[PDB]
A paper describes a structure:
In the present study, we isolated and compared four nAbs from three rhesus macaques that were immunized with a group M consensus envelope called CON-S. Although, the macaques were immunized with different CON-S envelope vaccine regimens, the CON-S nAbs had immunogenetic commonalities, and were able to exchange immunoglobulin chains with each other and still maintain envelope reactivity. To investigate whether the antibody sequence similarity between DH840.1, and DH846.1 translated to similar variable fragment (Fv) conformation, we determined the crystal structures of unliganded DH840.1 and DH846.1 antigen binding fragments (Fabs) at resolutions of 2.7 Å and 2.8 Å, respectively. All four monoclonal antibodies neutralized CON-S, but lacked heterologous tier 1 or 2 neutralization. Overall, all four antibodies bound to Env gp120 where C3, V3, and fifth variable (V5) regions converged.
Antibody DH840.1 was recovered from one culture well that exhibited neutralization. Despite being isolated from different macaques vaccinated with different regimens, DH840 and DH846 antibody lineages were both inferred to derive from IGHV4-n and IGKV3-d heavy chain and light chain variable gene segments, respectively. In DH840.1 these amino acids were V29CDR1, R30CDR1, E91CDR3, and W94CDR3 in the light chain variable (VL) region (All antibody residue numbering and CDR loops are designated using the Kabat numbering system). Alanine substitution of W100bCDR3 in the heavy chain reduced antibody binding to CON-S by 64%. The reduction in Env gp120 binding by DH840.1 W100bA was more severe when the envelope glycans were modified to be high mannose glycans by kifunensine treatment or GnT1 knockout. Changing W94CDR3 in the VL also reduced binding activity in the presence of high mannose glycans but to a lesser extent. Thus, W94CDR3 and W100b CDR3 enabled DH840.1 to accommodate the presence of high mannose glycans on Env. In summary, one of the principal amino acids that conferred DH840.1 Env binding was a solvent-exposed, germline-encoded tryptophan at position 100b in the heavy chain CDR3. DH840.1 Fab approached the Env tilted more towards the trimer apex than the other three antibodies, but still contacted the same site on Env. The binding stoichiometry of CON-S neutralizing antibodies may be important for neutralization potency, since DH840.1 exhibited the lowest trimer occupancy and the lowest neutralization potency.
Numbering used by the authors:
A (entry chain H): 1 to 35, 35A, 36 to 52, 52A, 53 to 82, 82A, 82B, 82C, ...
B (entry chain L): 1 to 210
Write the structure that this text describes.
């Protein structure tokens, strides 16, 4: 009965200030016990950042980043924002905002999380991907795919036949190449007898670069 | 100063059996532990708060317990919908989560289907070609992929990626990409992908010319 939605830039230059806004829908923000920010670094679990309490406005933050983080609250917009300053590349993570509940004990726990927003910290520029088809060499099952090469930053969306084909599809997580750019594959297994009577297209979407490409695979 | 350590890192449980996850606090914290479930690409969902209280909507199969320093999350009759990462959280003003525990179901040994994809013709115009080898639907999580160009081993020039455990058949897929320059790709002939896996009696090799 409460929905949270993170907002902010997906790419931030180093040493700048990351500003993320958490829009709350369903209830008043001050009707909640407390609100918090938690991020998910690559190769790391959940790491709590800040927590603001409604009745007092008091803030608690992780000591390893105390002077670099603040939180503002706008009751008119029914939202609260997180501001991280002097941002380094260590701050690249998926940032969530969540509602806290103290139960009878008064100790906080999160009961409602937002979608989460990926923020990459890099001085690199936004780059669109190159999409190449993946077909076997020129046997009861064929493997078709698309290679989404050299894009920045994450993420990208890949669907097959405009979401009409889901079975046998495997979209692999992206791999960070040593060039600073990402590349992933998205494969699908189909009956070999259907290759002549069935078209297979991959729908690649890279919102950071405003790129959209559909590739016919044969 | 209080730390919460989870154990084990990965947990492999047969379908219908019991999964027992551990969360150890460095100091006695009574019942101030909350458990969360997080699936890949999704937000964390609250399972247990105050050590043993189920969140609304959480089935009776899952139940938390423990007081003091050691805490346990139990998943009885494990379901394919239970494959996720589970976090325990210390309920304090200075919050802190555990490292997380990945849970997967146990399956019969499944051999992988090995496919290899020659680079498209528009790749060579770019100056860089990428050949992809696909390992599709195998249960033993780890395999060994080897790239051989004219018999020369070239594994350190590739990158691999593994998808999550499938919700339907409970297998894993792997995709390796060997990235070379066009001026180096045109100077060699045979490009082979050698796969070693538990479900294979001998290594499987897929190759192509040109």
């Amino acid at each position: 009965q409460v929905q949270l939605k993170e907002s902010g830039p997906g790419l931030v230059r180093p040493s700048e200030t990351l500003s993320l806004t958490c829009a709350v829908s369903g209830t008043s923000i001050n009707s909640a016990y407390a609100w918090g920010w938690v991020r998910l670094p690559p190769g790391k679990g959940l790491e709590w950042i800040m927590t603001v309490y409604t009745s007092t406005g008091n803030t608690y933050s992780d000591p390893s980043l105390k002077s670099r983080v603040t939180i503002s609250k706008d009751t008119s917009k029914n939202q609260f924002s997180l501001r991280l300053s002097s941002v380094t590349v260590e701050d690249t993570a998926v940032y969530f905002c969540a509602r806290a509940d103290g139960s009878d004990s008064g100790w906080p726990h999160f009961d409602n999380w937002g979608q989460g927003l990926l923020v990459t910290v890099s001085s690199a520029s936004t780059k669109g991907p190159s999409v190449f088809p993946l077909a076997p060499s020129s046997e009861s099952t064929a493997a078709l795919g698309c290679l989404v090469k050299d894009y920045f930053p994450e993420p990208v969306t890949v669907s097959w036949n405009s979401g009409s084909l889901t079975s046998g599809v495997h979209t692999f997580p992206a791999v960070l190449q040593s060039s600073g750019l990402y590349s992933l594959s998205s494969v699908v297994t189909v009956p070999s007898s259907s290759l002549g009577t069935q078209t297979y297209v991959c729908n690649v979407n890279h919102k950071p670069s405003n790129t959209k490409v559909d590739k016919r695979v044969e | 100063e209080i730390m919460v350590t989870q154990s084990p890192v990965t947990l492999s449980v047969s379908p219908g059996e019991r999964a027992t996850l551990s969360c150890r606090a460095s100091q006695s914290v009574r019942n101030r532990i909350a458990w969360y479930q997080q699936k890949p690409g999704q937000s964390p969902r609250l399972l247990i708060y105050d050590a043993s209280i189920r969140a609304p909507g959480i089935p009776d199969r899952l139940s938390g317990s423990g007081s003091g320093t050691e805490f346990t999350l139990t998943i009885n009759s494990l379901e394919p919908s239970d494959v996720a990462v589970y976090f325990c959280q210390l309920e304090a003003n200075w919050l802190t989560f555990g490292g997380g525990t990945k849970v997967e179901i146990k399956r019969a040994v499944a051999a992988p289907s090995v496919f290899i994809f020659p680079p498209s013709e528009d790749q060579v115009k770019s100056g860089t070609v990428s050949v992809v080898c696909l390992l599709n639907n195998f249960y033993p999580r780890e395999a060994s992929v080897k790239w051989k160009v004219d018999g020369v081993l070239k594994t350190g020039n590739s990158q691999e990626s593994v998808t999550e455990q499938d919700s339907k058949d409970n297998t894993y897929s792997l995709s390796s990409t060997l990235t070379l320059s066009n001026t180096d790709y045109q100077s060699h002939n045979v490009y082979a992908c050698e796969v070693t896996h538990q479900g294979l009696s001998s290594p499987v090799t897929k190759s192509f010319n040109r």
